[PDB]
Amino acid sequence: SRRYDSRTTIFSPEGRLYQVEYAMEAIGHAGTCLGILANDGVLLAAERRNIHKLLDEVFFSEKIYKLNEDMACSVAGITSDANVLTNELRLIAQRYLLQYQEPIPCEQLVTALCDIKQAYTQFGGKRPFGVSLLYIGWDKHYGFQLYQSDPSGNYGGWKATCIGNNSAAAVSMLKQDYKEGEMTLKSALALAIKVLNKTMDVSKLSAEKVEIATLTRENGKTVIRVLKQKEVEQLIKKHEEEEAKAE
Amino acid sequence: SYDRAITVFSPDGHLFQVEYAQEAVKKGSTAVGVRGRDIVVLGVEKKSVAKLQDERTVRKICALDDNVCMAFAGLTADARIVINRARVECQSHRLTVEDPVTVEYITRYIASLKQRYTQSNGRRPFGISALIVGFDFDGTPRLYQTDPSGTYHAWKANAIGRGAKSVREFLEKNYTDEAIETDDLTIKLVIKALLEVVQSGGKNIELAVMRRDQSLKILNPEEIEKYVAEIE
Amino acid sequence: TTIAGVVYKDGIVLGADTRATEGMVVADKNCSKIHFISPNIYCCGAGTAADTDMTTQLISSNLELHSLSTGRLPRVVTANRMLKQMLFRYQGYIGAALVLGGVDVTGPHLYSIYPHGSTDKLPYVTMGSGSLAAMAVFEDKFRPDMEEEEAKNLVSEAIAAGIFNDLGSGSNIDLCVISKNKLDFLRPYTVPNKKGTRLGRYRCEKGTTAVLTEKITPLE
Amino acid sequence: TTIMAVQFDGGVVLGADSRTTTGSYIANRVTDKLTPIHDRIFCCRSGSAADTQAVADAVTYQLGFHSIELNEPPLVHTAASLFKEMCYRYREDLMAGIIIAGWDPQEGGQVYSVPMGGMMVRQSFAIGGSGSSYIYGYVDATYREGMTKEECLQFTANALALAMERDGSSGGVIRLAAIAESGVERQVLLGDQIPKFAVATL
Amino acid sequence: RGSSAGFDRHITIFSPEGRLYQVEYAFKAINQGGLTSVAVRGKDCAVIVTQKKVPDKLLDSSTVTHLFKITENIGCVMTGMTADSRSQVQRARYEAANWKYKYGYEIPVDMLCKRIADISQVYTQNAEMRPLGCCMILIGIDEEQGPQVYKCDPAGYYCGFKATAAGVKQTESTSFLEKKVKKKFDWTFEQTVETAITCLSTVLSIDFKPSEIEVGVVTVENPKFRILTEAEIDAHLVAL
Amino acid sequence: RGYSFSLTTFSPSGKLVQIEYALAAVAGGAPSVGIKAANGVVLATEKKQKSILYDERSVHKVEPITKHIGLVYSGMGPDYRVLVHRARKLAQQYYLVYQEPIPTAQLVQRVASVMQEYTQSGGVRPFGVSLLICGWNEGRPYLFQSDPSGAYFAWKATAMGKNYVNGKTFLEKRYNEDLELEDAIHTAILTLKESFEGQMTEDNIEVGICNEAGFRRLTPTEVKDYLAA
Amino acid sequence: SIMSYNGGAVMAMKGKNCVAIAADRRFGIQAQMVTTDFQKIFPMGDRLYIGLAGLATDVQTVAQRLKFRLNLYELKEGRQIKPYTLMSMVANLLYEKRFGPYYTEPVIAGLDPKTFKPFICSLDLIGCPMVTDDFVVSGTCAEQMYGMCESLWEPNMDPDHLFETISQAMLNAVDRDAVSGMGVIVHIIEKDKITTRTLKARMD
Amino acid sequence: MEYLIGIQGPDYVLVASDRVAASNIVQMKDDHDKMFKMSEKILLLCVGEAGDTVQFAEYIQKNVQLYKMRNGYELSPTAAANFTRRNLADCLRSRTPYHVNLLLAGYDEHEGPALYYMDYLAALAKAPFAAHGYGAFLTLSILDRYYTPTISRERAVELLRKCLEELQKRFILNLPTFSVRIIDKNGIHDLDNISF
């Protein structure tokens, strides 16, 4: 019926896809998720949004997801759509390992998902996926890599990027604080707390309100580890000490 | 299957969905292509350097095959879909004919796809215009343009995207046998054309050259700076 | 295979041998041929082991979905109809000969299903390569409305006949008793045959096998 | 297998042996080949057990829906036609010889033979199975028009007994059924109840 | 209160308060026919009395009925749109047949009600079709639960009831029954017909005549659904 | 055929109002409570009938999915019956392949997937029901919530339906990590009691419990005992 | 003769808190050897392994398709697979090809991912699982392997005695099979270590 | 039949193929090429049924070339061998099976030289040296008797000559010329055809 159709996959008088733009506004109201590439590894630092006291911790992470043995991703937007896209990302990775028997290159995995996202924006008559993902990983072609994808199906590699609430302010601070070629996971795990301490206006980082994951290569094996709350608390403590010292 | 007609005629005979697609191309970055005697040059404006962004991932100049390469203005996601379809097509052609596709063969296919999306149910026109540039087996330098309508024409030099009219006006008065005799002169013609629109100059201008019987070459930022100074 | 079943006064006694053979060699000396279809229904299976251990597993899942929706105990007629209507659409390609037995709200019911879809509701049933040895015991000793211990001794005697007379049958005897008040699955009910005691020690001490290479990977 | 059905002025008598066989083995020695498709319509099944059980189950389902929709007792011809439809459609994938005999309020007691191949024919009396061949001359010599339910029950019992004694694939007990407007009366003849015929001595 | 945003009241989608107006308008269709149905269960009997209105003397009254036999032992009284009603009577008759063919036993009345309610719910979640404007009150005898009166509605809701009513005077009938059942239940006994006949009679102020009402009954002694004849209905009406 | 276009779409503020409206139907549902104790989980729901003419033992709100997994809901019961069937069919598909009871977390994810589809498929509305799933696996009790959007959450104690906010505040002040299923059953009855309006009876409320033994629905008689204390 | 086309032999044995899995190493077509280092035992976890014998294409395909499902299950369920679940998974894959099967019969040897209890198993070519508490054999020398393991296996063998038994059983059985051998590899799986050894074997 | 040979050395992979195409009892071509350039450092030598070799080989070649165009880098010898095996194994139980025996040879700047033997059933094995054809029966033993892991590219061509001279003396089929190519860090190099 033409009367009840919303016509999601169509252009606007100014060459604009409004369903995609409206979905991007949704992403800008979700928990801040920051990714920083260092010379020794890559990190994803998301702001926990499920912080009620009657919530049970029953999983490895709420925002970070392992898609391969060498790749992981954080999501900002609609959680339900992220569960769909993360399951598809995991299958694309397994389908490649079956055909070639080698782990999937990182940009190849991001392109596959962005091709699916772009298809929902051109044909089908269905809404786009309101989820922007930050992907971290390591391959034997380009090494440690960080990528960002949007509901438009448009992806890009970054040295440091943020998605979610107060994302613009974060990118600004990362731009004036990131030293390309001179970043160690220690200085990376430090700028993360600094940016989160400014993006998350809600009081100060409380460790329970943040999640931090690191991807590193140890003895020819990629290891993804979500820092324990003890480690995150020590990081937040050091940041407070440093700021006070500079005062 | 969703089978509504997205692209339909309007009183006055105007397919507005196709016109809206061209508005998206006009919002795209400026892409300039000059066809020389032994070198075809394609240069794109790197809007914002980003500083914290790997450039290898946001390149708007690609190679459909060993002899063909294209630049685009408009939606980057729609372009990736068109580039992949054309890359697969070039290989299918080599398998059914055992010869490299001709520049116009691939331009015809990319246009025919961009056209079927304007007369097929459940689809929106592609919001991208391309500049397919290559060298035919005879060795003739080739430059073609595709529109979101599926229309394609050969050009000696053209410009797509934001500030296309200004850049094309410049190329209309600065294109001659003189500014094409030297490969360096051809490269500096594209550089000057973009510099008319690009404000940063040198820092925000990607450029690529495909000489005869040679792969696409992406000029390094230092090499671009050399010409930008010589062109000053 | 020697699977048998009898209907007694209070319920049903099912029994089976425990031998699986690949060719003329024994592969499993303790296979389970009695399967749970529902708390009140069990099924002994003969024929292709993979077919009898998948037709039963699928019917158990479907009767579970049926019992969750109905809120009532499953009827043995439902299992028979489901099993027969599937074995029929496969025309004997799925080789599953089964002895379905259970007690429902209408009493105890024993059925025989053949790989082509044929069923038979009978007071005593035998299937497998040891079926005729087991039938000879039932056609010689079966009496209507027996007691559990009497009916259990009958099904063990029928299974023994197949174990000692059939070459595709052997090992232990399993018996499943189902009443309206009790389900007793006696897996090792009777162990009639055992391996003889080793008379010589052939243990090889450390150093007997010469190795060419060795790599110890420490596990954390 | 020996299946037999006869019509009388008011209903039909049906009969069958009780032997199922895999080769020369008797898998079931007390089988019921007389199946009720409706209240007063029964079928006598012969041939493949799985094929005959599947078609009879399908026709009972279709006939049941038809009777509840058309609020009226089913006609014996309709059941025979639905049996014919399937047995002809799957004649190459189904070994099934059936006799559809029952009582309807409009045409009385009717016996229909739907043989292998899918053909359907109304008959005063019908016989079927591997034992049918040994009693063709008997039924042709002993059948008389105007017989009664009692005479018809004896004809079926005597004929099935002779066939069960000559066919190895026939034997066990003789299951009899009488269908009329009153209802369906079922009877099993076993042991000395089964009619006997003296053997020779020479 | 009645906030609306979009096609909330044209297709089956949630209103700003999550209401689904289309299903609400499908319950207004049940009362467009103008007739009321009452079903009461007793100790060993379930009765379905409905109002019969043959408007013209030219219409054959044998064809004007709302009582239906889904199976020999399951009976139905349909209230609402007549054509939608005959559609659900057919789906019930088919689901009951498919049940015996696949499971080997007659469908429980609760299971027929759940299947019909599940199909009805799909009309509430899909926008291509309108919900059906008809209510089905099913009656049967369960082997372990005895008399069973179940009702499904245009929303997909089904429940079992000691006594129920559907139609224009559903509310008034509910109150009448929601006082007799409280005192001592619909006086259990095949004479539970009197409670139903008096409920419909009182709410639709009218002294019914043997031809103005239809009565269907299932009993533990005679479990088969039966439609009482004018003479049987007259006996009960004369008794009261 | 059917409409192949999404009836749920993004609003200029980046919100899917149809799911917001489905959550309004879940908040207008009868009160439901879930409490994860150390030895099991209790799922309690207010089941108040409109009249005495309803057979209270005919239709149930607390329903078993497997033998260790049980569910309760707040919203539209017809839509709940659809999700109960799919949950059971998904739970059986797991057993048919892995031959082990489905982990409660795997069931919540698989059910939440079906719910998300009804927010992006064509011609369909989102499910107007929020589910509370309780399960016992790996010798640990699990309590999860599922929203009409397809989002699932793990909880130690939670309330849904009318007066869910005040109920969650009550549970926040009463819930203790070290509790037993028996103490948990009392707090769940107290939470529903705070927002009941009437006399909670063995038939006005429905309670289900999951333990090492498995999931089960407390009999009206068993609930009668708890209500007495 | 579709299983003897490429030959092969795999055996899994239980010990006290330890498992062993051995395999021949020859890859050949009919009577011609092409390689003497073919893998037939694949890692399905830290203390879990699967030995595959049959058509070599089917050995490689079944291993690769099993890893696809295992990696998906491990990421989704966020836990290592327990030995028994892997067996149920292989049975599902093999029976999904019941009418047109993979000519490979698998043996699974591993220790429970938490209790570290020894689990060994064998499945048929259509997926019929048989869990044993002693030993499991599969290949073209199965009869020879049965006789050797039935006369040499002892209960509660230690890690070193398990190696001397699985090794002696494999070497004397493949020496009576013409299309099996060209080397023997043995993995001893314990709670804290995985020792892999290659045995000196007849290369005839 | 047709002959394929591959000898992997410390830094190179030497491959040879017969150059004869026969109809029945007549050679219709003595300059045939059975080697296909999948990449700049990967070669596929394919023999088998007529029509099946080029249909499968050209398919694998255009798909490996699409990878380079789509990703900007090339598939490794091992990834290419596995992609080929999956396609040959995924058409085996199909109605359109390819009867083809292959030898993939390539050089990864990291893993080094590699030679992969694959039969028509799609069984992939990495081998120091391997051959396909009835001539393999008369030459595999010469390679086993003289192949040493540290063989030089010069001694590798000499052993290739020993094997092809054996085919001239004992083989019943006239295989006169052989196409010889080598792969290394510097890519694929055509060498003089060993003719007799």
Ligand SMILES: CC(C)C[C@@H](C=O)NC(=O)[C@H](CC(C)C)NC(=O)[C@H](CC(C)C)NC(=O)OCc1ccccc1
């Ligand atoms: C529960 C029982 C069915 C198990 C047992 C009893 O019969 N199975 C058996 O005895 C049969 C023997 C055969 C003559 C049927 N053996 C089997 O079924 C064995 C299973 C054991 C190795 C564990 N598997 C087997 O041989 O299947 C091969 C096969 C493959 C494809 C089609 C048909 C048969």
Ligand SMILES: CC(C)C[C@@H](C=O)NC(=O)[C@H](CC(C)C)NC(=O)[C@H](CC(C)C)NC(=O)OCc1ccccc1
């Ligand atoms: C139609 C029924 C009344 C059966 C009746 C036939 O008329 N009596 C029979 O004896 C017929 C003989 C038939 C082959 C001519 N028996 C049968 O058709 C038998 C019955 C099975 C339950 C064993 N069917 C059969 O041989 O194939 C099914 C089967 C499948 C697996 C194992 C053994 C047998």
